[PDB]
Write a protein that binds this DNA or RNA. Structure first.
Ligand SMILES: [Mg+2]
Ligand SMILES: [Mg+2]
Length: 89
RNA sequence: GGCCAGUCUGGCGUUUGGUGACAGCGCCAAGUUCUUCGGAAUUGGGAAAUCCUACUGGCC
Protein backbone atom coordinates (compact mmCIF):
# COMPACT_ATOMS: atom_id res chain seq x y z
CA UNK A 1 0.00 0.00 0.00
CA UNK A 2 0.94 3.66 0.41
CA UNK A 3 3.64 4.60 2.94
CA UNK A 4 2.22 6.46 5.93
CA UNK A 5 3.63 9.09 8.26
CA UNK A 6 5.09 7.38 11.31
CA UNK A 7 5.39 3.97 9.64
CA UNK A 8 8.43 1.86 10.51
CA UNK A 9 10.58 0.78 7.57
CA UNK A 10 13.58 -1.47 7.07
CA UNK A 11 16.08 0.09 4.67
CA UNK A 12 17.12 -2.38 1.97
CA UNK A 13 19.28 -0.21 -0.35
CA UNK A 14 21.81 2.54 0.32
CA UNK A 15 24.62 2.80 2.84
CA UNK A 16 22.04 3.00 5.65
CA UNK A 17 20.76 -0.46 4.62
CA UNK A 18 19.54 -3.03 7.15
CA UNK A 19 18.66 -0.32 9.71
CA UNK A 20 15.17 0.55 10.90
CA UNK A 21 13.83 4.07 10.42
CA UNK A 22 10.59 6.08 10.55
CA UNK A 23 8.75 7.73 7.67
CA UNK A 24 8.36 11.41 8.51
CA UNK A 25 7.27 12.90 5.17
CA UNK A 26 5.63 11.61 1.98
CA UNK A 27 6.67 13.74 -1.00
CA UNK A 28 4.70 11.84 -3.65
CA UNK A 29 3.83 8.27 -4.63
CA UNK A 30 7.54 7.43 -5.02
CA UNK A 31 9.66 9.46 -2.57
CA UNK A 32 9.60 9.77 1.22
CA UNK A 33 11.88 11.17 3.90
CA UNK A 34 12.99 9.01 6.82
CA UNK A 35 14.69 9.69 10.13
CA UNK A 36 15.57 7.73 13.26
CA UNK A 37 16.41 10.57 15.66
CA UNK A 38 19.94 9.22 16.19
CA UNK A 39 22.40 8.87 13.33
CA UNK A 40 19.80 10.37 10.96
CA UNK A 41 17.93 13.20 12.73
CA UNK A 42 14.86 15.06 11.45
CA UNK A 43 16.63 18.30 10.49
CA UNK A 44 18.72 16.33 7.98
CA UNK A 45 16.23 13.57 7.16
CA UNK A 46 17.14 11.09 4.43
CA UNK A 47 15.30 11.27 1.12
CA UNK A 48 14.38 7.80 -0.15
CA UNK A 49 12.73 6.14 -3.10
CA UNK A 50 10.06 3.99 -1.46
CA UNK A 51 11.24 1.00 -3.51
CA UNK A 52 14.46 1.07 -1.44
CA UNK A 53 12.48 0.45 1.77
CA UNK A 54 10.53 -2.47 3.19
CA UNK A 55 7.26 -1.34 4.76
CA UNK A 56 6.79 -2.82 8.25
CA UNK A 57 3.25 -3.40 9.57
CA UNK A 58 3.75 -0.99 12.47
CA UNK A 59 2.80 2.70 12.58
CA UNK A 60 3.70 4.83 15.60
CA UNK A 61 0.68 6.88 16.74
CA UNK A 62 2.94 9.24 18.71
CA UNK A 63 4.85 10.30 15.60
CA UNK A 64 1.69 10.68 13.52
CA UNK A 65 -0.04 12.61 16.30
CA UNK A 66 2.97 14.90 16.74
CA UNK A 67 2.84 15.97 13.09
CA UNK A 68 -0.92 16.58 13.19
CA UNK A 69 -0.87 18.59 16.42
CA UNK A 70 2.52 20.33 16.09
CA UNK A 71 3.59 20.00 12.44
CA UNK A 72 6.93 18.45 13.45
CA UNK A 73 8.44 15.58 15.45
CA UNK A 74 11.38 15.57 17.85
CA UNK A 75 14.34 13.23 17.62
CA UNK A 76 13.50 12.07 21.14
CA UNK A 77 10.07 10.91 20.00
CA UNK A 78 11.57 9.13 16.98
CA UNK A 79 14.03 7.26 19.20
CA UNK A 80 11.18 6.28 21.51
CA UNK A 81 9.03 5.08 18.60
CA UNK A 82 11.82 2.87 17.24
CA UNK A 83 12.95 1.59 20.64
CA UNK A 84 9.35 0.73 21.51
CA UNK A 85 8.86 -0.95 18.13
CA UNK A 86 11.92 -3.17 18.63
CA UNK A 87 10.77 -4.26 22.10
CA UNK A 88 7.39 -5.50 20.82
CA UNK A 89 9.06 -7.45 17.98
C1' G B 1 11.67 -5.61 -25.30
C1' G B 2 12.01 0.05 -26.33
C1' C B 3 13.74 4.99 -24.87
C1' C B 4 16.48 8.38 -21.40
C1' A B 5 20.09 9.05 -17.51
C1' G B 6 23.89 6.57 -14.59
C1' U B 7 27.50 2.89 -11.84
C1' C B 8 32.50 -0.47 -12.01
C1' U B 9 39.08 -4.70 -9.44
C1' G B 10 38.25 -7.87 -4.60
C1' G B 11 37.82 -8.36 1.06
C1' C B 12 36.87 -6.01 6.04
C1' G B 13 35.39 -1.39 8.46
C1' U B 14 32.60 3.18 7.87
C1' U B 15 27.92 8.84 12.44
C1' U B 16 30.36 11.20 5.12
C1' G B 17 27.79 12.33 -0.35
C1' G B 18 24.09 9.95 -3.47
C1' U B 19 16.81 7.81 -4.33
C1' G B 20 20.21 4.10 -5.90
C1' A B 21 23.94 0.96 -8.32
C1' C B 22 27.95 3.17 -5.97
C1' A B 23 31.31 6.89 -4.30
C1' G B 24 34.48 9.00 -0.41
C1' C B 25 37.55 7.64 3.89
C1' G B 26 40.83 3.69 6.87
C1' C B 27 43.29 -1.05 6.38
C1' C B 28 44.74 -5.58 3.67
C1' A B 29 45.06 -7.59 -1.23
C1' A B 30 44.63 -8.13 -7.14
C1' G B 31 45.24 -6.72 -12.39
C1' U B 32 47.32 -3.27 -16.08
C1' U B 33 50.96 0.47 -17.65
C1' C B 34 55.34 3.29 -16.82
C1' U B 35 59.95 3.58 -14.01
C1' U B 36 65.53 7.18 -13.12
C1' C B 37 64.22 1.11 -8.93
C1' G B 38 62.95 5.90 -5.08
C1' G B 39 58.50 5.23 -6.99
C1' A B 40 54.36 7.10 -10.54
C1' A B 41 49.63 6.53 -13.04
C1' U B 42 45.45 3.67 -13.68
C1' U B 43 40.99 -0.10 -12.77
C1' G B 44 33.83 -3.99 -15.94
C1' G B 45 34.73 -6.22 -21.41
C1' G B 46 37.12 -3.78 -25.31
C1' A B 47 42.85 -0.33 -29.25
C1' A B 48 38.47 2.53 -29.50
C1' A B 49 33.15 3.92 -30.69
C1' U B 50 26.76 7.25 -31.09
C1' C B 51 29.98 -0.21 -29.09
C1' C B 52 28.95 -4.37 -25.44
C1' U B 53 27.98 -7.79 -20.36
C1' A B 54 26.27 -6.94 -15.43
C1' C B 55 23.98 -3.56 -12.18
C1' U B 56 21.11 1.32 -10.69
C1' G B 57 17.16 5.37 -11.29
C1' G B 58 13.16 7.16 -14.58
C1' C B 59 9.22 6.62 -18.71
C1' C B 60 6.45 2.78 -21.57
MG1 LIG C 1 36.10 1.29 -5.91
MG1 LIG D 1 15.47 -0.55 -15.35
Amino acid sequence: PSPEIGQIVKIVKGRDRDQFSVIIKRVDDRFVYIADGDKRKVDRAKRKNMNHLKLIDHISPEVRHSFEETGKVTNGKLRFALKKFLEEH
